[PDB]
Design a binder for these strands. Structure first.
Ligand SMILES: [Zn+2]
Ligand SMILES: [Zn+2]
Lengths: 92, 97, 43, 91, 80, 80, 91, 92, 100
DNA sequence: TTCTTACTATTTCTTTTTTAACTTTCGGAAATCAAATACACTAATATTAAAACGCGGGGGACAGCGCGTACGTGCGTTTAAGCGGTGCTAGAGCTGTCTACGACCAATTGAGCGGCCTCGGCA
DNA sequence: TGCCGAGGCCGCTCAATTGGTCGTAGACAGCTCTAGCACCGCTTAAACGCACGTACGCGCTGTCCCCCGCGTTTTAATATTAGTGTATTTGATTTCCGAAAGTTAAAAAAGAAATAGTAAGAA
């Protein structure tokens, strides 16, 4: 079977541009890109986790890894979006 | 959990998925949520920058040339996505005199 | 060699590490324990 | 030099596969045949090579162009291609 | 006539047009054939290794993407 | 007088001697100060991140080597 | 040009730290101070930077040298350094 | 404590040049280099193992990984040395 | 009998198999893989060491310094091609003069 | 006044203490054998876009020549590195213990997926 | 403009979740102490301006070479259809290492057993 992100992606695209259409090949492009960034951040987090002799992956380590894989203000505007959802989730 | 944090991307799928990689001994609680938030923000960013070119070329279906206009513009994103290749992507329009 | 059972001896049914398919089996021919394998399927 | 600049942007818009696919396919099958197995391919894998091939070739073209423009000429000689590949790592 | 000359001088000139040049030599075509052949050996050696290890007697696109990942180059659109 | 001018023109000339040149401009020193400063920001940002994450208030050499590993550069001799 | 070639190989043998360490240390402490923490260092980490720093600087020196030799002059201008860094990836 | 390779390395160096001496800093250099190659090959083997849906790391996978990390005849003269010791070990 | 003597090697396979369990590379470690890897590591260590010994022999020096390792690793290709991005601490550059 | 004499490290004999190695258990991985199934590749044409491929011709590459700014280049100093302590107090290690927290084992699903279709919105 | 697309449709099956255990973290607490940084205060080697000329980057002119014209063939092209014979993937089945149990030892320090110096006290 196919583990696409297509429903999620197509429901994301209606948030901003609710009229624009998408291509299946383009869908594959950004799906592969999403998997790439996910693998990059998770691999980086794993290396620093095994560095500091820790056995678990908390959101502290993810906060470090997003701050190093993402550059500059893209990181600084991903940290705030990252730390927002966890506190909304916790107070629920 | 996706409704419990307001996310459009599946938290539980990610939380199952990184466990299937032996990335460490244990997986913490808020970390898949943190990944889901980061991926959602990045998807929102790239869809903004894609939909700009999509409107500006008077098109509805996003074609990958309109995507490579988006990737090759944001210098932080293009710096992050330096070593990438996209099929039928095109080239950056830039020449000398 | 008589590659004819390719099947575990009774010692292998107790201790399934591999099966040699020997006389009486090389699984049985380590600890000098013919007696269990001549008290077995026994061809 | 009647046509040099109104056509250099003409194919910058028409994003397609530019290297013609059949001699590319025969070349890759021959150099695969130089390795041991008589090894067939998925049909998609040919294009999967071909886009990466054209990407590398365009990248080296642009790099040696900018090198030759620094070299205060407008023509590319293989002397500049050797420079552009040598400064970029591989050789 | 082997297939390395199947890469025609109009095709190299055409990619050169997309490259961003107008004047080129005639030595360019033979030089770029050598460079491109070196690139293809250095990638399909890895691809054939990935095909041979998995005991599969045909090459697919995921093998290609996995091979290109070793070069420091990533190709989306086909899975990877 | 900040420390970016602490990199003396004799030091740049001396490294240029080990570099393999004999004629250089006077614009070279200011240009290479800019390039070197850009390199140092792009490495010590990662090193300070690695120091900050482990809740340690000092930087050691393993942090340096781990930071340089991100650049695509490996340094032996100090552990890594 | 009395001394240009008998000394260019003199320091190719004497492998040492060439950048003087104290202003290097003050520079790195100042640009660390531009980041938030008042963050001290291991003493070895200064040299651990310094060898990598000199390695990068020698690499760019040699690259822009070979570029300028292709540029049919023997002098380096910053125009060539900008070329050498621009063709090499980063900017 | 320190997990050096110093005794092993110093006993290796007597095999060929039994009179030459070594430096402690030089000892650290090639020890770090050995750890680097070990991490490279093991990480590469892990990625291809998780690729082919396998849960264990046999010497087949190591044979692939040494054949890709090491280049050319250095790989071809490491494969033979690698496959020699395993058969000597097995017939013991 | 120890496993290294049982195989005829010098680097510790008992350490190598122990590190791979603690390395989280995959779920299980096939027996035979760590000794196979230990053989390659034992090969490469002496392989570079012989070139370093030859570098110390042409300068009549009874003590290996990092310049010897730098010169050895930069002289021949396929090792310099393997280590194409490393910089040894206090290593220096090859003797090179160009046609000026 | 060196013949002695028990200190005195010392240096080698012997043992404890710090791990690695040889058996069981067996579960879940992995190989095997057979069948179903997909498919990659030959082969017929049919264009037909596309490569050679010419004989102009012009425009760029390239070489020679003044030249003068603008580089090395000792020379004479001043200025800090840097070596050598002091030194004292900050963080790094480094254990004692334990509240909390994820692994996990079951139930309990609904939601995110194949697969048609009905409808005609984008090139 | 039309023709083939692209969402919008229903059935459904398997992962998401919910709720408890509980084994063991890493998390604070209270150390011991380097060790790093601050500081003085020496040298003395190196940076820094100065006249100092030659080069050499550079601009100009001439040359002439070769690279792109576009008509005109000429040769190989995508692009179809069908066969089709291989490889490939499931799937029970069966065999079987992998881990994990640790209890023979062992590693090198530790203390002692000579032991070869070893400072002093009379011919
Ligand atoms: Zn048996
Ligand atoms: Zn038996």
């Amino acid at each position: 079977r196919k583990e696409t992100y297509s429903s999620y992606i197509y429901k994301v695209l209606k948030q901003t541009h609710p009229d624009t259409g998408i291509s299946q090949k383009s869908m594959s492009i950004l799906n592969s890109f999403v998997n790439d960034i996910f693998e990059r951040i998770a691999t980086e987090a794993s290396k620093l986790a095994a560095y500091n002799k820790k056995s678990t992956i908390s959101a502290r380590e993810i906060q470090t890894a997003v701050r190093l894989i993402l550059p500059g203000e893209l990181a600084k505007h991903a940290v705030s979006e990252g730390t927002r959802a966890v506190t909304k989730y916790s107070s629920s | 959990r996706s409704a419990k944090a307001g996310l459009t991307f599946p938290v539980g799928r990610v939380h199952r998925l990184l466990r299937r990689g032996n990335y460490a001994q244990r997986i913490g609680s808020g970390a898949p949520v943190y990944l889901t938030a980061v991926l959602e923000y990045l998807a929102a960013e790239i869809l903004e920058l894609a939909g700009n070119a999509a409107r500006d070329n008077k098109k509805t279906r996003i074609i990958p040339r309109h995507l490579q206009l988006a990737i090759r513009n944001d210098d932080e994103l293009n710096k992050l996505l330096g070593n990438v290749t996209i099929a039928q992507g095109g080239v950056l329009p830039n020449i000398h005199q | 060699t008589q590659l004819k059972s390719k099947h575990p001896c009774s010692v292998c049914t107790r201790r399934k590490v591999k099966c040699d398919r020997m006389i009486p089996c090389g699984n049985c021919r380590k600890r000098g324990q013919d007696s269990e394998c001549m008290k077995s399927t026994k061809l | 030099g009647t046509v040099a600049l109104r056509e250099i942007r003409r194919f910058q818009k028409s994003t397609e596969l530019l290297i013609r696919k059949l001699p590319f396919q025969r070349l890759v099958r021959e150099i695969a045949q130089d390795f041991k197995t008589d090894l067939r391919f998925q049909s998609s894998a040919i294009g999967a090579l071909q886009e990466s091939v054209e990407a590398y070739l365009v990248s080296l073209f642009e790099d040696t162009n900018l090198a030759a423009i620094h070299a205060k000429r407008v023509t590319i000689q293989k002397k500049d291609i050797k420079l552009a590949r040598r400064l970029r790592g591989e050789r | 006539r082997d297939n390395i000359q199947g890469i025609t001088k109009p095709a190299i000139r055409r990619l050169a047009r997309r490259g961003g040049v107008k004047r080129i030599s005639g030595l360019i075509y033979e030089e770029v054939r050598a460079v491109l052949k070196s690139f293809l050996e250095s990638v399909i050696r890895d691809s054939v290794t990935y095909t041979e290890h998995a005991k599969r007697k045909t090459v697919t696109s995921l093998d290609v993407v996995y091979a290109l990942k070793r070069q420091g180059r990533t190709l989306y659109g086909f899975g990877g």
